[PDB]
Amino acid sequence: SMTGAVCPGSFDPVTLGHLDVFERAAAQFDEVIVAVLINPAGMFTVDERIEMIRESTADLPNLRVESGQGLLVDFVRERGLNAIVKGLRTGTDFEYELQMAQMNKHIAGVDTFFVATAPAYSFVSSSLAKEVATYGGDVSALLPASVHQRLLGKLR
Amino acid sequence: SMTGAVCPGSFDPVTLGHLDVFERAAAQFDEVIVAVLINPAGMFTVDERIEMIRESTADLPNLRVESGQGLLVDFVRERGLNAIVKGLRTGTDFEYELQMAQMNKHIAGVDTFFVATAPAYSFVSSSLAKEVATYGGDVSALLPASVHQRLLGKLR
Amino acid sequence: MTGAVCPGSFDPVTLGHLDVFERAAAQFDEVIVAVLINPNKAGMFTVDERIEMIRESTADLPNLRVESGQGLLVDFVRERGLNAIVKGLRTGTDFEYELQMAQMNKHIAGVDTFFVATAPAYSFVSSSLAKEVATYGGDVSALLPASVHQRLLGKLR
Amino acid sequence: MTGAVCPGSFDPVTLGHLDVFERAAAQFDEVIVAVLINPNKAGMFTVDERIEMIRESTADLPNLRVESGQGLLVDFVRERGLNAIVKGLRTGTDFEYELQMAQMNKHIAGVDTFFVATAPAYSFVSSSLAKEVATYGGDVSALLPASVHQRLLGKLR
Amino acid sequence: MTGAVCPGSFDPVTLGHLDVFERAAAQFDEVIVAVLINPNKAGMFTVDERIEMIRESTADLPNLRVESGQGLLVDFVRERGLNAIVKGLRTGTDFEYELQMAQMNKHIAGVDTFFVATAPAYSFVSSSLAKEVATYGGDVSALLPASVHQRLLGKLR
Amino acid sequence: MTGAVCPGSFDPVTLGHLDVFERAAAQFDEVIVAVLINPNKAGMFTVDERIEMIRESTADLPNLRVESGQGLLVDFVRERGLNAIVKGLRTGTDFEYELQMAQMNKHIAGVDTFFVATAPAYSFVSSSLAKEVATYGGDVSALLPASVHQRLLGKLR
Ligand SMILES: O=C(O)c1ccccc1C(=O)c1ccc(Cl)c([N+](=O)[O-])c1
Ligand SMILES: O=C(O)c1ccccc1C(=O)c1ccc(Cl)c([N+](=O)[O-])c1
Ligand SMILES: O=C(O)c1ccccc1C(=O)c1ccc(Cl)c([N+](=O)[O-])c1
Ligand SMILES: O=C(O)c1ccccc1C(=O)c1ccc(Cl)c([N+](=O)[O-])c1
Structure with missing residues (x-):
C-alpha cells in the first residue's frame, strides 16, 4: 500500500499542461515527486x-x-x-x-x-510560451497565475 | 493508500505482451482488474x-x-x-x-x-498470432504456455 | 468570387465540424457544405x-x-x-x-x-465516438451542437 | 545466386508496384513477383x-x-x-x-x-483507391499502368 | 477582399514552396509571401x-x-x-x-x-537538404527553381 | 556481382547495426560498411x-x-x-x-x-543513448557488441 511515481522534466517554466499531469499522477499514486532537471541554459x-x-x-x-x-x-x-x-x-x-x-x-x-x-493544452510547451511572450504575444491563459507574472518580470 | 487500475481488452487470446502489461500494472497499483470484453465473434x-x-x-x-x-x-x-x-x-x-x-x-x-x-513483443498481437498459427507457422514463443496448447487444440 | 466545399457525412455534425465551417465561411466568399448520401451504408x-x-x-x-x-x-x-x-x-x-x-x-x-x-477542445470528438458513447449512456452534451444533442437522444430511444 | 520475392495481391498492379519491381530487379539476380490470392474473396x-x-x-x-x-x-x-x-x-x-x-x-x-x-510521383495511388475512384467515374488514365487502365474500365462496365 | 499570407524563411525558395504560392493565389484574392528574417542568424x-x-x-x-x-x-x-x-x-x-x-x-x-x-514530385526537397547536398557537390539542378539553382552554386563557391 | 553500402557514423557500432550488416551480407554478393569521417563534429x-x-x-x-x-x-x-x-x-x-x-x-x-x-530486442538502442547512459554510470553491456563495451568503458574513464 505504498505506491509512488516520479514526474521529471525541465519545467522552464511549468505550464498548465504539466500541472495537469502532476494532479493526475497525484490522484493515482500514494506519493509523487516532481523532479526538476538541473542542466549545465534556462530562463x-x-x-x-x-x-x-x-x-x-x-x-x-x-x-x-x-x-x-x-x-x-x-x-x-x-x-x-x-x-x-x-x-x-x-x-x-x-x-x-x-x-x-x-x-x-x-x-x-x-x-x-x-x-x-x-486537449485544451495540446499545443502548449514551455518553449513556445516563452517565444511568443518574448515577441509580445499573450500567453496568460496557458501558464499558471504563479508563473505568468514571474515570466513578465523576466522579460521586463 | 488504496490505489487501483483496470486493464481492458479482448485478449483473444492473451499474449506475452498483454501479460507483461498486467505484471507492470500489478507492480505499481494496489489492485488491478483485468477486464475481458464481451462482444456480440471470437476464437x-x-x-x-x-x-x-x-x-x-x-x-x-x-x-x-x-x-x-x-x-x-x-x-x-x-x-x-x-x-x-x-x-x-x-x-x-x-x-x-x-x-x-x-x-x-x-x-x-x-x-x-x-x-x-x-521490445521483444513489439510485433505480437492476438490477431497476427492467430493468423500465422492458422497457416501452420510457429507462434509458441509469443504466447504463454497456457495459451499455446489451447490454441493448437482450437485449430485441430 | 472565391469558394470552397466542406464535405462529410456529418452524422451528426460535431462542434469540430462547425468550427471548420465557420473558418471556411470567414475566408471564402462562398462555402457549400456537402452532405454525403451513402446509398449503401445508411446512418443514424x-x-x-x-x-x-x-x-x-x-x-x-x-x-x-x-x-x-x-x-x-x-x-x-x-x-x-x-x-x-x-x-x-x-x-x-x-x-x-x-x-x-x-x-x-x-x-x-x-x-x-x-x-x-x-x-484543441474538441479534438477527440468524432461523430462515431459521440454516437457510441451516447448509445451506451455516456454524457456528450458538451461535445455536440445544440442542434444535435437532444435529437441524438431521441433517435437512441 | 541472390534473389528476392515481391509479394502483393496486385488487384490491379500500380505504377508504384512496378517501381518496386524494377528496383528489386536491378539489385538482385532474380526476382519473383508473388501474386498472393485469397481463395475466399475474389478480387476485381x-x-x-x-x-x-x-x-x-x-x-x-x-x-x-x-x-x-x-x-x-x-x-x-x-x-x-x-x-x-x-x-x-x-x-x-x-x-x-x-x-x-x-x-x-x-x-x-x-x-x-x-x-x-x-x-514520389505516383506513390499515393493504391490499388484500392484507384478502383474506388474509377468506380465513380474519376479520370485515372494518367495514374495507372497502360496494361491496367482500360482493363479496369472494362471490368467496371 | 479575401487574402492569405504564405510565410517562410525561403532560404532559398523551393519548388514545393512555389506550388503552395500558386495554389494560394488561385483561391484567394490576394496573396502575400512573407519572407521572415531572423535578425540574429544570417542565412545563405x-x-x-x-x-x-x-x-x-x-x-x-x-x-x-x-x-x-x-x-x-x-x-x-x-x-x-x-x-x-x-x-x-x-x-x-x-x-x-x-x-x-x-x-x-x-x-x-x-x-x-x-x-x-x-x-508529390518535389515534396521531399527542403531548403536545408538542397543546400546541404549542393554544399558537397550533389547534382540538384533538376530539383530546384531556375531562379535559385545557379545563384545557390554561386554562393557555395 | 550485386552489392550494397551500409553507411553510418557507428560511434560506436551497436548490436542493431551489426544485425543490419549481417542481413545485408546474407543478401548481397558484396557489402561495404562506410564509416563517416566528420571533420566538423568528432565523436567518442x-x-x-x-x-x-x-x-x-x-x-x-x-x-x-x-x-x-x-x-x-x-x-x-x-x-x-x-x-x-x-x-x-x-x-x-x-x-x-x-x-x-x-x-x-x-x-x-x-x-x-x-x-x-x-x-525487436535492440530497437531502443542507439549509439547516442548507449553513450549517454554509460557516461552517467548505467549498465549497457547487453546492448553493445563485445568489441565495443569494454573499449567504451575505457574512453569514459
Ligand atoms: O536519464 C537520463 O538519461 C539522463 C542522463 C543524464 C542527464 C539527465 C538525464 C535525464 O534524462 C533526466 C531528466 C530529468 C531529470 Cl529531473 C533528471 N534527473 O534529475 O535525474 C534526469
Ligand atoms: O468504452 C467504450 O467506448 C465501449 C462502449 C461499448 C462497448 C464497449 C466499449 C469498450 O471500449 C470496452 C472495451 C473493453 C472492455 Cl473489457 C469493456 N468493458 O468490459 O466494459 C468495454
Ligand atoms: O470522392 C469520392 O471518392 C467518393 C466517391 C463515391 C462516393 C463518395 C465519395 C466521397 O468521397 C464523397 C465524400 C463526401 C461527399 Cl459529401 C461526397 N459528395 O457529396 O459527393 C463525396
Ligand atoms: O550524403 C550526404 O548527404 C553527406 C554529405 C556530407 C557529409 C556526409 C554525408 C552523408 O550523409 C554520409 C553519411 C555517412 C557516410 Cl558514411 C558518408 N560517407 O562515408 O560518404 C556520407
Whole structure:
C-alpha cells in the first residue's frame, strides 16, 4: 500500500499542461515527486522553477518537488521508487519517449507510465510560451497565475 | 493508500505482451482488474479467455479477472476505480488510444495510463498470432504456455 | 468570387465540424457544405435531418449553404464552379488517409484541398465516438451542437 | 545466386508496384513477383488477369518472373530457395504495419524484408483507391499502368 | 477582399514552396509571401536575394506580392488586414509541429492556418537538404527553381 | 556481382547495426560498411577505432569489408561500382527523416536505398543513448557488441 511515481522534466517554466499531469499522477499514486532537471541554459533558475511548481501544487498533499541531476533512473531508485509518469501530446512524442522508457526499464527496472495531455493544452510547451511572450504575444491563459507574472518580470 | 487500475481488452487470446502489461500494472497499483470484453465473434469464449489469463497471472496476488460489457468507464467506476492501464506498441497506437482516453476522462473522470510494450513483443498481437498459427507457422514463443496448447487444440 | 466545399457525412455534425465551417465561411466568399448520401451504408440520421441540423447551427453564416451530394466529390465541386475543398484535421493520422485522397483529387480534377487544424477542445470528438458513447449512456452534451444533442437522444430511444 | 520475392495481391498492379519491381530487379539476380490470392474473396481481377497485367508491364525485366500463391508468404519464399522479400513504403504509417509482418516473418522462418521508398510521383495511388475512384467515374488514365487502365474500365462496365 | 499570407524563411525558395504560392493565389484574392528574417542568424541569402528569387519564379501570379518581416507572424498578417496563413505539408510529421504553431496563432490573434498537401514530385526537397547536398557537390539542378539553382552554386563557391 | 553500402557514423557500432550488416551480407554478393569521417563534429572514438571495432564484430562475414568515407554518400557508393544503400529502421519516425534523404539520393545519383526493420530486442538502442547512459554510470553491456563495451568503458574513464 505504498505506491509512488516520479514526474521529471525541465519545467522552464511549468505550464498548465504539466500541472495537469502532476494532479493526475497525484490522484493515482500514494506519493509523487516532481523532479526538476538541473542542466549545465534556462530562463528560470532551478530554485525559481521549484518555487513556481510548489505554489501551483499546494493543494496536492502527497506531492513534493526536488531538483535532480544525472541518470533519471538513479534519482528514482534512490528514493525507493520505480515508476516515472510523463505526459504525451502526440504520436511522435510517444516515439521519442518510448526509446527512453524501454532503455530505463532495461538498465534499472524502472517503469514509465504515460498520460495523454488535456486537449485544451495540446499545443502548449514551455518553449513556445516563452517565444511568443518574448515577441509580445499573450500567453496568460496557458501558464499558471504563479508563473505568468514571474515570466513578465523576466522579460521586463 | 488504496490505489487501483483496470486493464481492458479482448485478449483473444492473451499474449506475452498483454501479460507483461498486467505484471507492470500489478507492480505499481494496489489492485488491478483485468477486464475481458464481451462482444456480440471470437476464437475463444469469454470464459476460456478468463481462464487463460488466471492461469498466467497466478503469481500476481493483487490481480483479478472479470468479464465486462458496455461503456468501459461504467465498468471502472462501478468497481470504485478511476484508472485504466493499457500497453502501446507504436505512435499510431497512441493516436487511436489518445482519442478514447480524452473522451473517457471527459465523460467520467477516468484517467488512462499507457505503458510502452516490452521490445521483444513489439510485433505480437492476438490477431497476427492467430493468423500465422492458422497457416501452420510457429507462434509458441509469443504466447504463454497456457495459451499455446489451447490454441493448437482450437485449430485441430 | 472565391469558394470552397466542406464535405462529410456529418452524422451528426460535431462542434469540430462547425468550427471548420465557420473558418471556411470567414475566408471564402462562398462555402457549400456537402452532405454525403451513402446509398449503401445508411446512418443514424437521414440526410434531410443532417441538413436541417447543420442549417440550424449555421444560421448566422449567410455565405454558407448546405446541400446533399452523391458520388465523386470532385464532380460535385466542379459542377458548382468551384475547385477547393476545406476539411478539418485533428491529428497526424488524420493527415495520412486524407493526404492520399487530397492528392488524388488534385490529380484527377485539379481540385485543391485545404486542411485546418481542429480547435484543441474538441479534438477527440468524432461523430462515431459521440454516437457510441451516447448509445451506451455516456454524457456528450458538451461535445455536440445544440442542434444535435437532444435529437441524438431521441433517435437512441 | 541472390534473389528476392515481391509479394502483393496486385488487384490491379500500380505504377508504384512496378517501381518496386524494377528496383528489386536491378539489385538482385532474380526476382519473383508473388501474386498472393485469397481463395475466399475474389478480387476485381482473376489470377490469370493479374499475372497478365504484370507481365505486360515488366517485359523489359529479364530476371523477373511472375507466379501466384496462397497461404504463408514465408513458405512461398523458402520453397524457391530464397529468404528475402522486397516491398515499397510511402509513409511512416505503412512502415509501422509492415514492420509487424516483417518481424513476424523473420521470427518464424528467418526471412528478411527489405523496404524501398517508392517513387514520389505516383506513390499515393493504391490499388484500392484507384478502383474506388474509377468506380465513380474519376479520370485515372494518367495514374495507372497502360496494361491496367482500360482493363479496369472494362471490368467496371 | 479575401487574402492569405504564405510565410517562410525561403532560404532559398523551393519548388514545393512555389506550388503552395500558386495554389494560394488561385483561391484567394490576394496573396502575400512573407519572407521572415531572423535578425540574429544570417542565412545563405540576404533578404534582397530571397525576394528576388521568389519574384522571378512568381512573375505569372498577378495577385501575389512579396514582403519581408520579422517577429510574430500574426502581427505581420493582421497589419495587412488579413487573418489567414497558407502553408504546405508533406507528412504527418510536418502537420504535428505545424499544428502547434497554428493553434497558438489562432489562440493569440485569431489568425487561421490552412494547410495544403504539396505536389508529390518535389515534396521531399527542403531548403536545408538542397543546400546541404549542393554544399558537397550533389547534382540538384533538376530539383530546384531556375531562379535559385545557379545563384545557390554561386554562393557555395 | 550485386552489392550494397551500409553507411553510418557507428560511434560506436551497436548490436542493431551489426544485425543490419549481417542481413545485408546474407543478401548481397558484396557489402561495404562506410564509416563517416566528420571533420566538423568528432565523436567518442576515432574512425580507425570505429573501423577496428566493426571488423572485429564482422570477422565471419567474408563478403563484407569496412572503409572510411567522407563527403557525399552517393559519390562514395558510385565510386565503388555500386548503387544501393542498406540501412536499418527502428520506427516510423526513423522512416521520416531517412525517407527524404533516400528520395534525394535516388534523384541526384540513381542510388537505391533499402531499409530493414531492426530486430525487436535492440530497437531502443542507439549509439547516442548507449553513450549517454554509460557516461552517467548505467549498465549497457547487453546492448553493445563485445568489441565495443569494454573499449567504451575505457574512453569514459
Ligand atoms: O536519464 C537520463 O538519461 C539522463 C542522463 C543524464 C542527464 C539527465 C538525464 C535525464 O534524462 C533526466 C531528466 C530529468 C531529470 Cl529531473 C533528471 N534527473 O534529475 O535525474 C534526469
Ligand atoms: O468504452 C467504450 O467506448 C465501449 C462502449 C461499448 C462497448 C464497449 C466499449 C469498450 O471500449 C470496452 C472495451 C473493453 C472492455 Cl473489457 C469493456 N468493458 O468490459 O466494459 C468495454
Ligand atoms: O470522392 C469520392 O471518392 C467518393 C466517391 C463515391 C462516393 C463518395 C465519395 C466521397 O468521397 C464523397 C465524400 C463526401 C461527399 Cl459529401 C461526397 N459528395 O457529396 O459527393 C463525396
Ligand atoms: O550524403 C550526404 O548527404 C553527406 C554529405 C556530407 C557529409 C556526409 C554525408 C552523408 O550523409 C554520409 C553519411 C555517412 C557516410 Cl558514411 C558518408 N560517407 O562515408 O560518404 C556520407
